[PDB]
Design an enzyme around this catalytic site. Structure first.
Site, mmCIF file in Angstrom:
data_model
loop_
_atom_site.group_PDB
_atom_site.id
_atom_site.type_symbol
_atom_site.label_atom_id
_atom_site.label_comp_id
_atom_site.label_asym_id
_atom_site.label_seq_id
_atom_site.Cartn_x
_atom_site.Cartn_y
_atom_site.Cartn_z
ATOM 1 N N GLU A 9 6.663 -0.625 1.056
ATOM 2 C CA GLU A 9 5.653 -0.333 0.007
ATOM 3 C C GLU A 9 6.326 0.484 -1.108
ATOM 4 O O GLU A 9 6.028 0.232 -2.287
ATOM 5 C CB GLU A 9 4.460 0.391 0.626
ATOM 6 C CG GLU A 9 3.590 -0.516 1.509
ATOM 7 C CD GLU A 9 2.853 -1.650 0.784
ATOM 8 O OE1 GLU A 9 2.929 -1.738 -0.449
ATOM 9 O OE2 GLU A 9 2.148 -2.425 1.463
ATOM 10 N N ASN B 190 -1.400 -3.799 -10.009
ATOM 11 C CA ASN B 190 -1.838 -5.085 -9.411
ATOM 12 C C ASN B 190 -2.334 -6.006 -10.541
ATOM 13 O O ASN B 190 -2.791 -5.509 -11.615
ATOM 14 C CB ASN B 190 -2.870 -4.839 -8.294
ATOM 15 C CG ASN B 190 -2.423 -3.822 -7.262
ATOM 16 O OD1 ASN B 190 -3.148 -2.859 -6.959
ATOM 17 N ND2 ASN B 190 -1.239 -4.035 -6.702
ATOM 18 N N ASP C 32 -5.119 -7.542 -10.707
ATOM 19 C CA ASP C 32 -6.567 -7.296 -10.971
ATOM 20 C C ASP C 32 -6.791 -6.067 -11.865
ATOM 21 O O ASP C 32 -7.986 -5.756 -12.117
ATOM 22 C CB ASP C 32 -7.357 -7.194 -9.660
ATOM 23 C CG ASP C 32 -7.073 -5.968 -8.795
ATOM 24 O OD1 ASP C 32 -6.198 -5.165 -9.152
ATOM 25 O OD2 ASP C 32 -7.758 -5.813 -7.784
ATOM 26 N N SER D 51 -5.996 -2.938 -10.992
ATOM 27 C CA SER D 51 -5.921 -1.759 -10.103
ATOM 28 C C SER D 51 -4.444 -1.334 -10.019
ATOM 29 O O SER D 51 -3.553 -2.076 -10.496
ATOM 30 C CB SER D 51 -6.547 -2.060 -8.763
ATOM 31 O OG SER D 51 -5.728 -2.958 -8.043
ATOM 32 N N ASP E 183 -1.534 0.675 -7.289
ATOM 33 C CA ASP E 183 -1.139 1.196 -5.964
ATOM 34 C C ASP E 183 -0.348 2.497 -6.174
ATOM 35 O O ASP E 183 0.531 2.559 -7.057
ATOM 36 C CB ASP E 183 -0.319 0.142 -5.226
ATOM 37 C CG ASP E 183 -1.133 -1.042 -4.715
ATOM 38 O OD1 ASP E 183 -2.396 -0.998 -4.799
ATOM 39 O OD2 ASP E 183 -0.485 -1.993 -4.192
ATOM 40 N N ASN F 113 -4.520 1.707 -3.032
ATOM 41 C CA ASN F 113 -5.027 0.897 -4.155
ATOM 42 C C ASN F 113 -6.225 1.634 -4.772
ATOM 43 O O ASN F 113 -7.119 2.020 -4.038
ATOM 44 C CB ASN F 113 -5.359 -0.501 -3.603
ATOM 45 C CG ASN F 113 -5.627 -1.570 -4.640
ATOM 46 O OD1 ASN F 113 -5.958 -1.277 -5.766
ATOM 47 N ND2 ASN F 113 -5.555 -2.835 -4.240
#
Ligand code: NA
Length: 129
Positions: A35, A46, A48, A50, A52, A59
């Site tokens: 990650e 992301n 969309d 959003s 992380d 998220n």
């Protein structure tokens, strides 16, 4: 902070992540490796809109507030910036809620694609825990 592998394993164990929801310490260290490469300051946007945040790339769509994720929730009741601290308490506390949501560690796409079913004990090998 860029954690050492065993340094992060010790920290995760201290904070009660070892075998939390039945996931051994090596699963959590493996997730963190792919990650964030063990970097508390890791941020990734992301598709969309959003973001992380932090060692476990939590998220903003569901878990923390960053003020720029329309229609999102803050189920961990924290600013996403609290997930980038050198102190992983907030990330671990929030990770416990995520992994409890019903799909276990499949919530972390990198865990599912790169850690699940592998020799995750290798990630704590040689660590004094
Ligand atoms: Na949010």
């Amino acid at each position: 902070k860029v954690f050492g592998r065993c340094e992060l394993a010790a920290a995760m164990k201290r904070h009660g992540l070892d075998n939390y929801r039945g996931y051994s310490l090596g699963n959590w260290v493996c997730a963190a490796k792919f990650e964030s490469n063990f970097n508390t300051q890791a941020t990734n946007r992301n598709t969309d809109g959003s973001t992380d945040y932090g060692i476990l790339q939590i998220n903003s769509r569901w878990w923390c507030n960053d003020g720029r994720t329309p229609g999102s929730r803050n189920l961990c009741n924290i600013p996403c910036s609290a997930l980038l601290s050198s102190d992983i308490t907030a990330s671990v506390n929030c990770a416990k809620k995520i992994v409890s949501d019903g799909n276990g560690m499949n919530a972390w796409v990198a865990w599912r694609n790169r850690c699940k079913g592998t020799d995750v004990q290798a990630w704590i090998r040689g660590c004094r825990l």
